[PDB]
């Protein structure tokens, strides 16, 4: 199948510049009818920021044009963004997108990945565990910057009964989030449980076992 | 960011139909075609009709779009728990860019349920390193409307929690909210009691969940 996936999410600091590529598999990025990046606020709807032909020919959303650049590596069959003199108004989840054929009708989309503008720093989080006919445990996920974080149990094993919070913002300036769920009572004493977490803005991967 | 008008949300309950509309200008939606697209929570948007009223493979017939004038309209019909999401419009603007509304929120209607409630103490772990957070869950409940009161020795805390609230369940179509109350070490040890009440249209009185410190 075609997939796109952007670069992985982080941090910039206000007034420098946004780096983003897309790797396409299953596709030769030189076949594609464009390539594109929308973004998403958070909280809100979608803006477009650009899009670039087969011709090599560019077209920039016209608020934005001045400070971005949008390319294609044939060698690498990925594409980029470049968004210079960042500042919070570029905080959002960006996606990338094209269209494979211009016959076609339906474009690819990428993951998104959330870019934080801030002048705060990468903290990754600690993990601790919410100890346990029905039980509930879970993770805490404490003191971490930027967002996201995901988190899996038993290594995407358990989704039954799963919640995974939005984060809040602390007053510290770091979030904290918290995922749960609910299991049988009498499986405490013999299924293991482990919530799996990842901080990609900081390589932070820690799998956490919860015991009653 | 957004340029074109939706609703901010939409609810129904299943087997129903619900509208959602997008309304624009002369330039944009009066002169061109117009999509849209749903968005699952946490996910990237996927197009449910294109071109005003054409579906792409893959997506059922219970999908339906039109366009009138400088309006567009989508149409869900044979609504299921798994519809729930943001859904948005897109068209293209007097330059033949892009643009988009700013989202409608379907929600699903079902029964009320009442929350299930549980309260953690903070972990050991987290103890040694100097902070308690204690964390209280309600699970599963229907409306969104709950309200959590925090009591530790029975003084009501006012400031000191915050809350968040998941999106509707795709399967069962309700709610759970996880609110923490943070403490510092010292303080947590000054105190026995905490307990976490909850209040419900689904409970006939609060629930109290409770534990003492250390016990």
């Known amino acids: 199948q075609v997939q796109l996936q952007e670069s992985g999410p982080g941090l910039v600091k206000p007034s420098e510049t946004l780096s983003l590529t897309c790797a396409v598999s299953?596709?030769?990025?030189?076949?594609?009818?464009?390539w594109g990046w929308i973004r998403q606020p958070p909280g809100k709807g979608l803006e477009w920021i650009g899009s670039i032909y087969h011709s090599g020919s560019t077209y920039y959303n016209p608020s934005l044009k001045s400070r971005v650049t949008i390319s294609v590596d044939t060698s690498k069959n990925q594409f980029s963004l470049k968004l210079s003199s960042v500042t919070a108004a570029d905080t959002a989840v960006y996606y990338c997108a094209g269209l494979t054929q211009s016959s076609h009708n339906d474009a690819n989309w990428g993951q998104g990945t959330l870019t934080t503008v801030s002048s705060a720093s990468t903290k990754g989080p600690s993990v601790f565990p919410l100890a346990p006919g029905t039980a509930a445990l879970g993770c805490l996920v404490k003191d971490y910057f930027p967002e996201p974080v995901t988190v899996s149990w038993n290594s995407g094993a358990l989704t039954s009964g799963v919640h995974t919070f939005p984060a809040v913002l602390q007053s510290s300036g770091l979030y904290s989030l918290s995922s749960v769920v609910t299991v049988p009572s009498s499986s405490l004493g013999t299924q293991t449980y482990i919530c799996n977490v990842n901080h990609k803005p900081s390589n932070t991967k820690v799998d956490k076992k919860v015991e009653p | 960011q957004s340029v074109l008008t939706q609703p901010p949300s939409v609810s129904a309950a299943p087997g129903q139909k619900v509208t959602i509309s997008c309304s624009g200008s002369?330039?944009?939606?009066?002169?061109?075609?117009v999509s849209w697209y749903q968005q699952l929570p946490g996910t990237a948007p996927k197009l449910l009709i294109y071109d005003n009223n054409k579906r792409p493979s893959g997506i059922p017939d219970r999908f339906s779009g039109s366009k009138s004038g400088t309006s567009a309209t989508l149409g869900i019909t044979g609504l299921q728990t798994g519809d729930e999401a943001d859904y948005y419009c897109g068209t293209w603007d007097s330059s033949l860019n892009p643009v988009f509304g700013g989202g409608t929120k379907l929600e699903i209607k079902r029964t009320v349920a009442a929350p299930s409630v549980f309260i953690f103490p903070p972990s050991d772990e987290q103890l040694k390193s100097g902070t308690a957070s204690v964390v209280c869950l309600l699970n599963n409940f229907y409306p969104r409307e709950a309200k959590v009161q925090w009591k530790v020795d029975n003084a009501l805390q006012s400031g000191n929690s915050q809350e968040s609230v998941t999106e509707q369940d795709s399967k069962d179509s309700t709610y759970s909210l996880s609110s923490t109350l943070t403490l510092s070490k010292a303080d947590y040890e000054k105190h026995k009691v905490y307990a976490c009440e909850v209040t419900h249209q689904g409970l006939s009185s609060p629930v109290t969940k409770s534990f003492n410190r250390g016990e």
């Open positions: 002369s330039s944009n939606i009066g002169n061109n075609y």
């Open positions: 299953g596709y030769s990025i030189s076949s594609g009818y464009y």
